[PDB]
Write a new protein. Structure first.
Lengths: 51, 71, 64, 75
RNA sequence: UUUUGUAUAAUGGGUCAGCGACUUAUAUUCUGUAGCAAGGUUAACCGAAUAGGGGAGCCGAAGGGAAACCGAGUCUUAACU
RNA sequence: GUUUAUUAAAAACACAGCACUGUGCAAACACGAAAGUGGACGUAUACGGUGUGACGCCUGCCCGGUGCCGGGAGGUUAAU
RNA sequence: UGAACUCGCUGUGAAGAUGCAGUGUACCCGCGGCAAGACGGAAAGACCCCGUGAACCUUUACUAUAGCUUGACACUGAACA
RNA sequence: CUUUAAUGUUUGAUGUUCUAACGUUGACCCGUAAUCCGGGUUGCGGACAGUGUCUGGUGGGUAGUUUGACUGGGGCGGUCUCCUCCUAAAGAGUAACGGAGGAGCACGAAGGUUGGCUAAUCCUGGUCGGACAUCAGGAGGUUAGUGCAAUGGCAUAAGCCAGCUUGACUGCGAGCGUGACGGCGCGAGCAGGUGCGAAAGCAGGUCAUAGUGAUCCGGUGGUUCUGAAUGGAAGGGCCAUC
């Protein structure tokens, strides 16, 4: 319960994404982690977005 | 509607002309089969000119080594 | 009359050259974010049916 | 009665004993906390599992100032 | 007969004679056996008919892949020591 | 008075009486895919349904719940 | 009504014995009585349980549906306000 | 654009009147020396009523059904999956309505890495300040701590602070463990592309062990893989995911 789930979408590339969990009540701001896009084959800033 | 023609059953029709309908006439492949493909298997003696038919790279080496030119 | 195939089995299996049946792994439709990637990678490629539960598969889909 | 619950057993312990030849990747000891420690040609997994990193025979030894059971492999 | 176990005081049978229970058809796999063999085989059907025609078809001789597709390889993968 | 013919005759059912309630006549209700019958060739002092059970003394409080009756602005809402 | 050449006892054994062990007693065969036993006869226990058995019955169990009821369209029209 | 006036213009719920459909289990005449029925005259309702198709509500009136198992007989009660210890007989495994306890998550810092630190509890002294807040030393030494139960672990710390970060990464995976299977788990090394450190090296989540459910069905993203005459599409498939 509580901790909802989210869809980290790639900025620089296709619609490839990662899914992770996130406690939305404690942390209001959006995740902007740097992760690997395997379509482009490159590290890219994966911005947070809802399912 | 596609068949796997074995190279051993290639030269069993009419000298060296084996397009599709002539191959079908000898009862090597079924009736309702538009596309077909020659693969490697065993033995060519006479020169066979295949045309209007898909052919495999290993077969193409053999059929040319026997003598007959494809298309 | 002829033996009818268990059609549900016909869709979930496929006959190979030796005689065995390839099938798709389970636990890979949904609830995937919590599953580690190392599982999700190993549940992707097709798998041979074990000899223990082959006799069931041979019976329920005899024609190929 | 507030009892009658128990977990599935794990199958822990030693799998390959002293002198036994093992292949690279084979599990030697599958334990919870590092009761056995990694020596020569042995690694420690995230589950605290001792596994072979080369072909050869298993050697159980006791070494170090604090006196602990090290597992090692020699080809 | 059923049972862990029956002389059992558990079941069944008064006796005799007669009848009374793993069959048949079609598919399929496996073993044997006979034929012929990169071939084997015909169904319906026509037939001076349990001959002989009729190979429509089936099965086999190559698989891999969800599939397009490629094919002694191919799938996976951007690509496989 | 009636009742379990064939193990129960009773305190059970019925009963006259009482109350509620429905029914305005092509009645309500019932049987019947319908036509049509009973109700009744009766007409609210009549008919159906429910409960109670001669007679005498009486029958108190609760409308929150469940049903029923009435009200109709608002919210909600099907087909179209 | 399995067949009987169909005794008592204490013990044993499927755990209450005409049949087993040990022992005690008893000439063969009726007839009239009694009814303790032959777990006597009668009814594949009705009690209890079991079956993903059956039926009827109940309800604010699920699902439907006859009837009852609401509306839209039809049979269905003309004027005005 | 707001706000509204007159006219034309397009429709809408109502009410009153009408008669011609419809109704008439109203009266009379005829088929007919027939309470049926039909027809004709004439009253009374009247576009209501009724009947059909669709449609919401109600509906044990009537059907079809379901209503678990374990169980020291059944019912009542309790339990039913996962994790830890014991039972468990020094490898693994091992039952009972045996004995005790927990879980249905948490966290973008509580993950990663690089550099540095080491606890509990007492004792004495010291402002407010006390048995206990903060400070100083000494004794003790890991009796602590480890996001949450218990077990096994941890100083090379897996414990505790600080800086830069996102390896909680994609494709794989020799070879093992473990299950009847479904599955579950460990995993060196290889390819790409990262971060951390001066580099050797480390990182495929968290000290380990619980935090979870198969299939079908359907949704949401990406992929000319298919795509029924052909070209597209819908629908499938494959990959990501609810
Ligand atoms: Mg043919
Ligand atoms: Mg396959
Ligand atoms: Mg497998
Ligand atoms: Mg156990
Ligand atoms: Mg376990
Ligand atoms: Mg005996
Ligand atoms: Mg007997
Ligand atoms: Mg006897
Ligand atoms: Mg018997
Ligand atoms: Mg008998
Ligand atoms: Mg193939
Ligand atoms: Mg009397
Ligand atoms: Mg009578
Ligand atoms: Mg009687
Ligand atoms: Mg009497
Ligand atoms: Mg009597
Ligand atoms: Mg009426
Ligand atoms: Mg009437
Ligand atoms: Mg009448
Ligand atoms: Mg009474
Ligand atoms: Mg009374
Ligand atoms: Mg009302
Ligand atoms: Mg005795
Ligand atoms: Mg006598
Ligand atoms: Mg007598
Ligand atoms: Mg008896
Ligand atoms: Mg019985
Ligand atoms: Mg059952
Ligand atoms: Mg039932
Ligand atoms: Mg009229
Ligand atoms: Mg009439
Ligand atoms: Mg009448
Ligand atoms: Mg009339
Ligand atoms: Mg008329
Ligand atoms: Mg109407
Ligand atoms: Mg019912
Ligand atoms: Mg039970
Ligand atoms: Mg009990
Ligand atoms: Mg043990
Ligand atoms: Mg042991
Ligand atoms: Mg147990
Ligand atoms: Mg460090
Ligand atoms: Mg850490
Ligand atoms: Mg650097
Ligand atoms: Mg289902
Ligand atoms: Mg589908
Ligand atoms: Mg098309
Ligand atoms: Mg799609």
């Amino acid at each position: 319960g509580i901790r909802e789930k989210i869809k980290l979408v790639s900025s620089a590339g296709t619609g490839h994404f990662y899914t992770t969990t996130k406690n939305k009540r404690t942390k209001p701001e959006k995740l902007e982690l740097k992760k690997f896009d395997p379509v482009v084959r490159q590290h890219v800033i994966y911005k947070e977005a809802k399912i | 509607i596609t068949a796997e023609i074995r190279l051993s059953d290639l030269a069993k029709v009419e000298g060296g002309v084996v397009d599709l309908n002539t191959l079908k006439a000898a009862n090597i492949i079924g009736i309702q089969i538009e596309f077909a493909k020659v693969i490697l298997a065993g033995e060519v003696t006479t020169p066979v000119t295949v045309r209007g038919l898909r052919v495999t790279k290993g077969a193409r080496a053999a059929i040319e080594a026997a003598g007959g030119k494809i298309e | 009359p002829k033996i009818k195939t268990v059609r549900g089995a016909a869709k979930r299996f496929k006959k190979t050259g030796k005689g065995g049946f390839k099938h798709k792994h389970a636990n890979l439709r949904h609830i995937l974010t919590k599953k580690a990637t190392k599982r999700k990678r190993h549940l992707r490629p097709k798998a041979m049916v074990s000899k223990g539960d082959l006799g069931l598969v041979i019976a329920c889909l005899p024609y190929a | 009665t507030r009892n009658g619950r128990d977990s599935e057993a794990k199958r822990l312990g030693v799998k390959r004993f002293g002198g036994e030849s093992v292949l690279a990747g084979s599990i030697i000891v599958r334990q919870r906390g590092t009761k056995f420690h990694a020596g020569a040609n042995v690694g420690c997994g995230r589950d605290h599992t001792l596994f072979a990193k080369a072909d050869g025979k298993v050697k159980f030894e006791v070494k170090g100032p604090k006196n602990r059971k090290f597992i090692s492999i020699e080809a």
